[PDB]
Design a protein around this ligand. Structure first.
Ligand code: TCH
Ligand code: TCH
Ligand code: TCH
Lengths: 513, 258, 502
C-alpha cells in the first residue's frame, strides 16, 4: 500500500438543496408500499456500471451517462416489474482507482431534466453541479443523484425526463511508467437507493419490461446452426487479413429484435427460396426454369425494403439446387431434379430477385417436359464461391443493409465459420462462409425484442469443461461482435464454451486483448 | 431431450461419419459409414437408439455426400447415394452400433477417399412412420409412446411435406411431429420447472384476437386437444401459442367444433 | 462491515444435543491455512474469474478436520482472513462475497457478486482482510459425516490487475486464505473415533515403482517416463481407476487377472489349419458373465496383435492326460475374425496335424507372447458397439502423460529391440485406491516424487482424479526418470494449477 495517490475526492459541497422523495407522492398513491430495508444497506454494481478510460480517448468523451431511475440497481430493476411508479434519490459510488503512474481527471456532472440531449461539450459540463475527481483516487467517491422533478412521481417507463449523471473525460489519460505500456483505468459504478426511494402501485409483474437486460441462450456455438448456409457451426475465429467491414445480408439483426435485410427467423429458409416455376426446353442450355419468387411461408412477394425475399442467397456464385418437379412421362410422377443458377454478374445475367424473378437452367438431352407448378428450392452445391452481394436488381441500386461496422482502432470482427459443399475441379481445400451471429441468436432476438440501453453489450466466453473465461468481446447493438486483437495470423478459439452478457457499454469501451 | 432429438434445426434427419469405400464394379460404390456425432465428437452407444438427429422414419433415402476423388478434371464433387432405413429383414445397417451402409447405382468404378462426410437428406422413397432398424435385428433403448390421453382428447399434429420419389401417386407426403424446432430449442436452452402435469396453452390469431382453440401441452412435450369429431380438422398457422397456466392431468378442455 | 445479522451458533443447538463439546482454547489462537484457499492474479486474467470458492465446515482447519472424527455434529462460525501479496504499484480489486447455503450454481458474473454481503479489497492492501463466515442453516446442528449445504466464501476478480513486468516472472499477485474457529464453534456428541471418515487425505502406498507390477501386461514395471511423441490421448482399458475407488472399464483388482480369461472349453477337431476351440468367456472368479457396462470380461487384453493363450487341456489319449499346449489368438481386426468377447465368445487356433483328444471343461488362459503388437483398441465386437472408457485427458497446454513402461514377450522375425507397453497406474495403485475408497476433494492431487536415500525431489507431477498422472514437460526428447523413489501426496489443487517445468 502506498499513499502517493489521491486520498479521497470527498464529495465537494455540490450546489444543490435536498430534494423530497416519497413524502410528496405518498398522499397521491392509493397503497402503502415499502421495499426491503436491506436493499438500502449495500452498494451493488449498476447494470450499466462498467466503463474504461484508455489513452486513446480525448478530452470531452462521455464515459458514462446514466439517468436516475430503477435501472441503476439490479435489485430495483427487478422490483420494478411489479410497480408502476417511483420517486426518490439514489447514492452512487464511482470506483476508479487507477495505477500510481496514471494521470488525468474526470468530471461528473448533475444534468437536470429537460436539458437537451446530444453534444454536451466540455466547456459546458462544468456549468452544472459537478465533482472533479482524479482517476487515481483510492476510496470510492459517493455522489448523490437527486429526484429533481416537475410531477409527483415518475412512471416506470423510460420516457420520463429525469436527472442524468454525466461523466466526461476532462483531461486525457497519460502514464509516467517507463515501460512500453499505458495502463487503462477501468472504473465501475455502484449504487443504492437513498433513504426515501419508493415504488408506487403494485401491478402484475411482467417480464417483458424496459429493464431486464439481454439474455443469450445456453447453447454451445458448435451445436448452433448457421445463419448464411444450412449447416452447423464448425468454429468461431478472428481474422484481421479479411474484408474488415463486410456487407452481408443474412444473420443480421438488431438486438432490439427488428431483423435487417433478407434474414429469416426459421433456420430452414436460409439459402433457400420458394417460387412458382415455368419450364421451357431448349436445344442449347436445356430447360430454362423461370421462377417467380414468393415467400417461403406462402405469401406473395411485393418488393419493399428488402433486396430479395426473406432468405435469398446473399452471396455470389453458381448455386446448384433441388426442386421436386412433376413430370408428364408415364412411369414416374414425382422427381427431385438439380438445376444450376448463377448469382454473380458473370458479365451477363437475366435474373433480378428484387423484381421477384430468377432464371435457373439444366442441360438435358431429351425434351424434358415437366408439370409447371410451384416449388421450394433448397441449395445443394456452390461452384466458385464469392462472398460479395449479388445483383438483387439487374444493375440498379437496391435497399441494402449497411456494412458491418464501424470498429474502434484495434477491434477485429468475430466470425462464426462454416464450410459449404462445393464443386472444385482443381482445388482440394474447404470453402468457408462466415456469419456474424448464428441463426440460433437471430431466432432468439426476434422472439424477445429487448430494450437496448446504450450502444453495446459486454460478453464473455466461458469454457464449459474448465470454467475458464477465454476472452471478452463486445456485441454492438447492430448484431455483430467485435473483439480486440492486434495479431496478424488468424486466431481461433475453442467452440465449447457458452456466451454470457455482462453489462451495457458505450462504443468507447476499450477491450482487453 | 428424449430419444435422438438434436438442438440445431440443421442436425435433423442427417448424419456425419468417417466414410470407407471398398464390390467396386458389381453395383457401384458400396460405402460403409462409421457414424460419429455431427459436432465432431466420437459416438458412444448409450441410451439413445442412434446418433443425434438420425432419421427415425422408415423407407429408402437419398443422401448428398462430398466425395474427394482422384480422377483428373475434378477434385471434389457432390454425390447422391442410396440409404435403406426401413427394416427390410435383410440389411447390414446398425445405426445403434455405429455402422451404416449406402450404395450407388454405378457401372464404372469411380474411386474416392476415406475422409469425413456430413450427409444430407435428399428424397425419401416409400415413406412410412415406424421405427427403423436401429440394431441389425435386435432391440434398443428408445423413447416411450406418446400418451396417454384423457377420454376425448386427440393428438395435435404439426404437418410438413417432404421430397419424395414416387412412381404412381402425385399427392404430398405429409410427416407429422409433436413440437417443431424453436420449441425443442427454447427448451434445453432455458430449463423450466414443471410444477404440474400440463400447460394450458391458448392458440389465438394475432389479428382480431379470435380464440382458435385451447390445448394441453403435457409435460412430456406433446399437445393434446379435446376434439370429438371423426375426420381431420386443420387450423390456421398464423396464430401464437400463449401459456395460460399449469393444469392438472384431469383438466377438461373446451371441445373444438368440426 | 458486512450486512448480516449475528448468527446464533451453539445456543440454538444446545437444548437438543446430548452434549456440547468444547475445543482446545489454543486452536482459537492460530490462523491455519484453508485447503484450496490459494490463488494468483496474473495480468492476463479477465474480471469475472473465480479465484476461490470454499464452504464453511470443519474441513477448513486441520485441527478440526481431525477433531471431527471423535464427534457427531458441529455448529458455529469461523473467522477467515485473506492475505494478498502486492506492492504499492499494482492496481486491481478483488471482491469476497458470502454466498448463502443454496443458490445453485453457474457463471457468477461480476455484476452479481456485488449483490451478496461482500467486501471489496484493493490488491495493494497491507494488513490481511479479516471477515466472518457465519453458519446460516435450516437445522439445529450439522452432521460431521455427511457433507451438507453451508455458507460459502466466493472470491472474484472485480477489476483487472495493471502492473509492469520485467521479462520473467510475469508478476502474479498471490493470495492465501487462512481460517480459525470463531468464539462459538462446538462439536456435539462424543462418539468412538472412526478411521474411514470423509476428511481423510489421499495417502499413497510406500512402494518404489520398480517393485510394482504392471497393469496391462502381467510383468514387473521397468521404467517410468514421459514421451511427447506417442499418442498423447490413449484409450487404454486396463489400469484405469478413479481416485475415489471406482474401476473404469476392464480393470481388475488383482494383477493375476491382467491379460487373462477364464473360458469354457468347447473343443472340436478340424482338418484345415489345425485344432480350433471356441471359448465361452466367464468372469475369472467363477461368476456368470453377462454383457453389461464393460467392453469385455474383467482383465481381457486391451492391445492388438497375435496372442497365444496356453491351456487347460485334459487329453484322454493314452500316454499323457494333462499337457500344456500353445493356442493362438488374433486381437487386431485382420478383416477375418469372429472376435466378440463382448458377447462372450472367442476363437483360438492351434496348428496341429492330427486330432488332439481334448475333453471339454473349464479352462483359463495365460499369455505366452505377442506378434505384431500395436497400441490400439482391439475388436471387443466385430464392428459394433463398445461401451468403453473415454480417452486419457485432457491435459493443460504443455503437459504430457507419465507412463509406466514394461516390456512384453515378443515373437519377432526381423529385429530384437524390446517393445514397451505402458499404463498410467501400476497394479498396486489400482488396488490401493479401490480398497480405501477415498473422498475426492477437488480435481487433481499434487504428487511429489522423492528419493528415499538422498532426500531430494525428482519432479512434481499431478494425479488427476480420473486416474492418470500428468507432468509439465517443455522439451521433445523422451526423458526417463529413476525408478527408485516414492510418490508423496502434497495437497489438492484445481485443474488449472500450473506445475513446475521438469
Ligand atoms: C413444393 C411443395 C410440395 C413438395 C414438398 O413437399 N417439398 C419440396 C421441397 S421441401 O421438402 O418443402 O423442402 C409444395 C406442397 C406444400 C406447399 C405449400 C403449400 O401449398 C403452402 C403454401 C401455399 C401457397 O399458395 C404457396 C406457397 C406454400 C408454402 C406451398 C409451397 C409449396 O408449393 C409447397 C411447399
Ligand atoms: C466435407 C465437410 C464440408 C461439408 C459441410 O460441412 N456441410 C455440408 C452439408 S450442407 O449442404 O451445407 O447442408 C467437412 C466441413 C467440416 C467437417 C467436419 C468437420 O471436420 C467436424 C467433424 C470432425 C472430423 O473432422 C470428422 C467429422 C466432422 C463432422 C467433419 C466432417 C466433414 O469432414 C466436414 C463436415
Ligand atoms: C482350469 C483350472 C486349473 C488352473 C490352470 O489351468 N492354470 C492356472 C495358471 S494360468 O492362468 O493357466 O496361467 C481350473 C483349477 C481351479 C478351477 C476353478 C476352480 O475349480 C473355481 C471355479 C469352480 C467352479 O465349479 C467352476 C469354475 C472355477 C473358476 C474353476 C475353473 C476352472 O475349473 C479352474 C480355474
Amino acid at each position: 500500500s502506498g499513499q502517493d495517490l489521491v486520498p479521497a475526492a470527498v464529495e465537494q459541497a455540490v450546489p444543490i438543496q435536498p430534494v423530497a422523495g416519497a413524502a410528496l407522492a405518498a398522499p397521491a398513491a392509493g397503497q402503502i408500499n415499502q421495499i426491503d430495508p436491506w436493499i438500502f444497506q449495500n452498494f451493488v454494481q449498476c447494470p450499466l456500471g462498467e466503463f474504461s478510460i484508455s489513452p486513446r480517448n480525448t478530452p470531452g468523451e462521455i464515459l458514462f451517462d446514466l439517468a436516475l431511475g430503477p435501472g441503476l440497481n439490479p435489485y430495483l430493476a427487478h422490483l420494478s416489474a411489479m410497480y408502476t411508479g417511483w420517486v426518490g434519490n439514489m447514492e452512487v459510488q464511482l470506483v476508479l482507482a487507477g495505477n500510481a503512474f496514471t494521470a488525468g481527471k474526470v468530471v461528473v456532472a448533475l444534468v437536470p431534466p429537460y436539458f437537451p440531449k446530444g453534444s454536451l461539450t466540455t466547456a459546458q459540463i462544468t456549468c452544472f453541479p459537478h465533482v472533479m475527481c482524479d482517476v487515481r483516487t483510492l476510496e470510492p467517491i459517493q455522489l448523490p443523484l437527486l429526484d429533481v422533478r416537475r410531477v409527483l412521481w415518475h412512471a416506470t417507463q423510460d420516457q420520463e425526463e429525469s436527472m442524468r449523471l454525466v461523466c466526461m473525460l476532462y483531461t486525457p489519460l497519460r502514464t509516467n511508467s517507463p515501460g512500453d505500456e499505458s495502463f487503462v483505468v477501468s472504473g465501475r459504478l455502484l449504487s443504492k437507493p437513498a433513504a426515501d426511494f419508493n415504488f408506487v402501485y403494485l401491478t402484475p409483474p411482467i417480464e417483458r419490461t424496459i429493464y431486464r437486460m439481454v439474455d443469450l441462450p445456453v447453447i454451445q456455438p458448435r451445436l448452433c446452426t448457421h445463419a448464411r448456409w444450412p449447416a452447423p457451426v464448425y468454429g468461431l475465429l478472428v481474422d484481421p487479413s479479411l474484408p474488415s467491414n463486410p456487407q452481408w445480408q443474412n444473420g443480421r439483426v438488431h438486438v432490439d429484435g427488428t431483423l435487417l435485410g433478407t434474414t429469416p427467423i426459421s433456420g430452414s429458409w436460409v439459402s433457400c427460396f420458394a417460387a412458382e416455376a415455368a419450364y421451357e426446353f431448349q436445344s442449347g442450355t436445356g430447360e430454362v426454369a423461370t421462377f417467380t419468387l414468393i415467400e417461403q411461408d406462402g405469401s406473395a412477394y411485393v418488393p419493399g425494403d428488402r433486396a430479395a425475399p426473406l432468405g435469398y442467397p446473399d452471396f455470389s456464385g453458381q448455386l446448384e439446387i433441388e426442386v421436386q418437379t412433376e413430370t408428364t412421362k408415364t412411369g414416374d410422377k414425382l422427381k427431385v431434379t438439380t438445376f444450376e443458377m448463377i448469382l454473380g454478374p458473370t458479365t451477363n445475367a437475366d435474373q433480378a430477385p428484387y423484381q421477384g424473378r430468377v432464371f435457373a437452367s439444366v442441360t438435358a438431352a431429351a425434351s424434358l417436359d415437366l408439370v409447371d407448378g410451384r416449388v421450394r428450392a433448397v441449395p445443394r452445391s456452390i461452384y466458385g464461391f464469392q462472398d460479395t452481394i449479388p445483383e438483387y436488381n439487374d444493375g440498379l441500386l437496391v435497399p441494402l443493409a449497411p456494412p458491418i461496422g464501424p470498429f474502434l482502432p484495434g477491434e477485429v470482427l468475430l466470425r462464426f465459420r462454416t464450410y459449404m459443399r462445393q464443386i472444385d475441379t482443381a482445388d482440394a481445400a474447404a470453402e468457408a462462409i462466415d456469419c456474424a451471429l448464428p441463426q440460433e441468436f437471430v431466432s432468439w432476438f426476434a422472439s424477445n425484442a429487448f430494450t437496448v440501453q446504450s450502444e453495446a453489450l459486454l460478453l464473455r466466453y466461458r469454457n464449459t469443461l474448465t470454467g475458464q473465461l477465454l476472452f471478452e468481446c463486445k456485441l454492438y447493438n447492430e448484431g455483430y461482435i467485435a473483439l480486440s486483437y492486434s495479431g496478424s495470423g488468424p486466431l481461433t478459439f475453442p467452440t465449447d464454451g457458452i456466451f454470457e452478457v455482462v453489462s451495457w457499454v458505450p462504443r468507447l469501451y476499450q477491450l482487453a486483448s | 431431450l428424449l430419444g435422438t432429438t438434436p438442438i440445431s434445426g440443421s442436425w435433423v434427419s442427417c448424419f456425419a461419419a468417417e466414410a470407407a469405400y471398398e464390390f467396386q464394379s458389381g453395383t457401384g460404390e458400396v460405402a460403409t459409414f462409421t457414424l460419429i456425432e455431427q459436432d465432431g465428437s466420437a459416438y458412444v452407444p448409450g441410451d439413445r437408439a442412434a446418433p443425434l438427429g438420425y432419421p427415425d422414419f422408415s423407407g429408402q433415402l437419398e443422401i448428398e455426400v462430398q466425395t474427394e476423388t482422384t480422377k483428373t478434371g475434378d477434385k471434389l464433387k457432390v454425390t447422391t447415394f442410396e440409404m435403406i432405413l426401413g427394416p427390410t429383414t435383410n440389411a447390414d445397417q446398425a445405426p445403434y452400433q455405429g455402422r451404416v451402409f449406402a450404395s450407388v447405382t454405378a457401372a464404372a468404378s469411380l474411386d474416392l477417399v476415406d475422409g469425413r462426410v456430413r450427409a444430407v437428406p435428399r428424397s425419401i422413397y416409400g415413406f412410412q412412420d415406424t421405427i427403423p432398424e436401429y440394431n441389425d435385428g435386435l432391440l434398443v433403448p428408445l423413447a416411450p409412446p406418446i400418451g396417454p390421453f384423457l377420454p376425448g382428447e386427440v393428438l395435435l399434429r404439426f404437418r410438413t411435406y417432404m421430397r419424395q420419389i414416387d412412381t404412381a401417386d402425385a399427392a404430398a407426403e405429409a410427416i407429422d411431429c409433436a413440437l417443431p424446432q424453436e420449441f425443442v430449442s427454447w427448451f434445453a436452452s432455458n430449463a423450466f420447472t414443471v410444477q404440474s402435469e400440463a400447460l394450458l396453452l391458448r392458440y389465438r390469431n394475432t389479428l382480431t384476437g379470435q380464440l382458435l382453440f385451447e390445448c394441453k401441452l403435457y409435460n412430456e412435450g406433446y399437445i393434446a386437444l379435446s376434439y370429438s369429431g371423426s375426420g381431420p380438422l386443420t387450423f390456421p398457422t398464423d396464430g401464437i401459442f400463449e401459456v395460460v397456466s399449469w393444469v392438472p392431468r384431469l383438466y377438461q378442455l373446451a371441445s373444438v367444433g368440426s
